[PDB]
């Protein structure tokens, strides 16, 4: 039966859209040159994409319950091409952000709609292995994206090439999907747009780029997001159409699956930002080097996603999410023990030894990887067919929102306790060095630098100790997932 070929064609679209997510990380500077922006106020090129990616997802997911899954993959691929062209044509930041928004909204649909395609063509008991492949295609593309950006600029010497190359690839993807997928009234537009508005307010309000973690425009957008979320809940009690129709949905396991997904997203983003900051601040790496620290964490995620799906066809979603999150917790407990000379250290197994940095990140990312497929499986288990699209979107939007809530909350606490640690360090370091090169002001500046580094390393520990604890809390919730 052609379902294997169909989900392969969908997975290649998911891969294609995932490259476009973080591709900008390697071409920001080349964009800054051509658009005329000084050494960032460039952030709309990521926050605008993420707005489209998150906010448009539930409604485009729901649209696939009505208009099917082939048509929306085609539409989003055409929109992914269109947005790419708009960005390639940009003399102006205002045109880049518009095109990135369209690319983001387009690319946001591909993963949920394809997860729902897998849910249509497979029964639950073997489905988790297929969700692992689709999820692997997402996590792998997200990680190869920056390299794809480098490579096409090495080919074509202009960053615009990224978004020109998107157009043929999108047309190729539409061709594969046209021949591969099964052939073939309203959705809740008002609720979808209300939810999109709420998600957007939260996404702008939470994202940030030194004694304050939210933008000053953040708090009112966040409080507005709660209000827009209430308005969404209130509307759909009086709506005839509902975005997720509650008939037959078992909400206790469904909502626990969303909350665990939220937790996993926080643990992901917490690691993505703190490890790179630990690279620059404690290890003294270039920004380009510090991002590359994330490699073994980033590579381990798709490996976990693929294998966790296969194991979950056999041992169950509850178990793989629980064990996978305990593997993630173990990884984060190890990362909490990092010293400032971690690159020089190894784990000693007596008769083999392993690099500390690389394997702690591998363990942490593999644990989070194991959880992607069985969480999606267990959310889809407790919803009817023709709610697969909106249900797949909910799991991803929960993960994406959990990323932003995670950094905001843990950075707030980390910053609070950093300052308390800084009080302790300044009180305890030798009040001056004896014969410092450059004189006493250089010794006092170095004392202040020494205090901030020592306090930052103490902050770093608690953050990943809490992140480990929250993974254990998620692992426990994993046992109240569906079965």
């Amino acid at each position, epitope marked *: 039966t052609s379902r294997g070929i169909a989900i392969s064609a969908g997975g290649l679209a998911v891969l294609l859209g995932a490259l476009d997510t973080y591709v900008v990380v390697s071409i920001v500077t080349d964009i800054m040159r051509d658009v005329g922006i000084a050494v960032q106020r460039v952030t709309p090129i990521i926050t605008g994409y993420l707005l489209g990616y998150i906010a448009a997802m539930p409604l485009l997911g729901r649209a696939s319950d009505r208009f099917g899954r082939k048509l929306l993959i085609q539409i989003s691929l055409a929109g992914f091409a269109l947005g790419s062209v708009i960005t390639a044509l940009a003399t102006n930041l205002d045109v880049l952000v518009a095109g990135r928004v369209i690319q983001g909204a387009a690319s946001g649909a591909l993963l949920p709609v394809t997860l729902a395609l897998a849910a249509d063509l497979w029964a639950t008991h073997k489905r988790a292995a297929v969700l692992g492949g689709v999820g692997a295609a997402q996590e792998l593309g997200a990680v190869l994206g920056p390299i794809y950006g480098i490579f096409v600029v090495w080919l074509f010497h202009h960053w615009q090439a990224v978004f020109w190359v998107n157009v043929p690839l999108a047309l190729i993807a539409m061709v594969l999907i046209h021949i591969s997928l099964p052939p073939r009234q309203r959705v809740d537009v008002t609720g979808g747009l209300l939810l999109a508005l709420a998600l957007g307010l939260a996404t702008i309000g939470l994202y940030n780029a030194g004694k304050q973690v939210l933008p000053e425009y953040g708090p009112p957008l966040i409080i507005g997001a709660v209000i827009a979320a209430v308005a969404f809940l209130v509307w759909e009690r009086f709506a005839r159409t509902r975005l997720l129709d509650p008939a037959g949905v078992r909400f206790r396991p469904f909502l626990i699956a969303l909350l665990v997904s939220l937790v996993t997203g926080g643990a992901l983003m917490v690691t993505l930002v703190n490890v790179e900051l630990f690279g620059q601040g404690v290890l003294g790496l270039d920004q380009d080097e510090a991002v590359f620290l994330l490699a073994r964490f980033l590579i381990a995620l798709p490996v976990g996603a693929l294998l966790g799906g296969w194991i979950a066809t056999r041992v169950g979603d509850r178990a793989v999410t629980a064990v996978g999150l305990l593997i993630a917790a173990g990884g984060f407990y190890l990362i909490a023990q990092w010293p400032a000379d971690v690159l020089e250290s190894r784990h000693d197994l007596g008769f083999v030894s392993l690099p500390t940095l690389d394997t702690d990140l591998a363990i942490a990312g593999f644990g989070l990887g194991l959880v992607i497929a069985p969480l999606t499986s267990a959310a889809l288990r407790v919803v009817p067919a023709a709610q697969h699209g909106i249900a797949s979107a909910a799991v991803v939007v929960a993960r994406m929102i959990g990323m932003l809530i995670g950094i905001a909350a843990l950075s707030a606490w980390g910053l609070y306790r950093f300052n308390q640690y800084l009080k302790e360090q300044l009180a305890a370091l030798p009040p001056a060095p*004896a014969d410092f090169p450059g004189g006493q002001m250089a010794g006092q500046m170095m004392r202040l630098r020494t205090a901030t580094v020592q306090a930052y390393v103490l902050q770093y520990g608690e953050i990943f100790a809490i992140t480990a604890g929250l993974c254990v809390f998620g692992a426990v919730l994993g046992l109240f997932i569906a079965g």
Partner: nanobody
Amino acid sequence: QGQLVESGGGLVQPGGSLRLSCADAGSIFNKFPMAWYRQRELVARISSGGSTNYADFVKGRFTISRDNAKSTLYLQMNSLKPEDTAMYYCARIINSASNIAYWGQGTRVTV
């Protein structure tokens, strides 16, 4: 706390011995590389996990070690020579790649 407080210097007859101590706080005692320096001149270095490293003039005559019960770094110095006369400092190496360090008021050793 987060200290670096030397003690244990004194007068020594050639061939004699001393144990220098460096009080610290367990919060950070085990999270950075440490070293002892002469007056600057590196004597001994220890990674956060205990990997030792020494200069040429040491000839295996000293040992750098950690005691986690009182969070003290030590130099046991044996068979001391007139050339070892110096101020000794215990230093925390705040960046290991650049070997940027911080240290306190030392302790003087005279042989």
